[PDB]
């Protein structure tokens, strides 16, 4: 049966400035099948108020999803995105890099 590994992107809606409100995004795309487990993390820890868009897909029938949450960047806080999916042998983690 077809299976595709998700692509992952960690980024903010707006250019990150310390002390201002923004959205932390985790874009996953592609993947197949649709069963996927996604979490956002602040200092190695799972964030509670995370929302995702509605399951949709591309020309090649692979799925994509946006997970997001309000946050105000600082100088010390670290953010990342943890993803699990059948094509991955262990949940893959991707740190947020503002710069870039």
């Amino acid at each position: 049966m077809i299976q595709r590994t998700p692509k992952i992107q960690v980024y903010s809606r707006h250019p990150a400035e310390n002390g201002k409100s923004n959205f932390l995004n985790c874009y996953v795309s592609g993947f197949h099948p649709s069963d996927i487990e996604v979490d956002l993390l602040k200092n190695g820890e799972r964030i509670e108020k995370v929302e995702h868009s509605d399951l949709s897909f591309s020309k090649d029938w692979s799925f994509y999803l946006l997970y997001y949450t309000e946050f105000t960047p600082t100088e010390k806080d670290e953010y990342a995105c943890r993803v699990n999916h059948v094509t991955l042998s262990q949940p893959k983690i991707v740190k947020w890099d503002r710069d870039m």
């Binding site: 077809i2 299976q3 980024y11 809606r13 874009y27 509605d54 029938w61 870039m100």
Partner: protein, 275 residues
Amino acid sequence: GSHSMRYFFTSVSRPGRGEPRFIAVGYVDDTQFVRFDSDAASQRMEPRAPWIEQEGPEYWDGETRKVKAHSQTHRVDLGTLRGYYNQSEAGSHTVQRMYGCDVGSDWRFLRGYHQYAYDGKDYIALKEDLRSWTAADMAAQTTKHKWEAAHVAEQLRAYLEGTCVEWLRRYLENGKETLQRTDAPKTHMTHHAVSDHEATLRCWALSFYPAEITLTWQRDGEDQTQDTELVETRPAGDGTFQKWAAVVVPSGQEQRYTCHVQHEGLPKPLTLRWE
């Protein structure tokens, strides 16, 4: 320019966990206005854009009514397609369905489509003429013959050439401030030292709409297609898109490189350069 309306239907069997999950989404161009999750509370077709929210009860009733029917059609299919492939009733499987229509600048019908996939692969799909089918394999031929018999294509042609374009045209009016906009990319370049002889010059395009965009890097005019890292165009979350492209530059050669941006919303393409 031209425009499109598309609906996306995903049905996922869950043996041992009740009925299959059914999600539906609707788009006009690169914007969504509809959605439905069999698992949600409302059991309604819901709005996902401000310009569709005040359509009325009829619209919401109509859409909800039909989407529930779509869901049931797909419930049946998941069972039929198991047998077709002699599949064990334990495995969870996927059916996908997409259809929609396009118009051109003149807002007249341009082309319609309707495809179908089992477990992530082309299964069966309508041809450009909107009168015939193209099955991917042995199983799908049976389905082909079924729908041929039931004159199914003729009804899809009617919807596609009528209701489909009609409402696409109606929504383009309803949300003319959203759907008839051209958010030009806001662009800039970043520079980052990797080592002591290598730098990172990645170009940026932000807050643009629609998604369609071209970012390319060049050295002395020569294209660095093979030497460019390009990301998938990504959602900003606010209805705009983002994309970037990075090259590695032997420190001292930055001025050899230029980035080029092409988008509907630009008068002319941009020729950035870390001069």
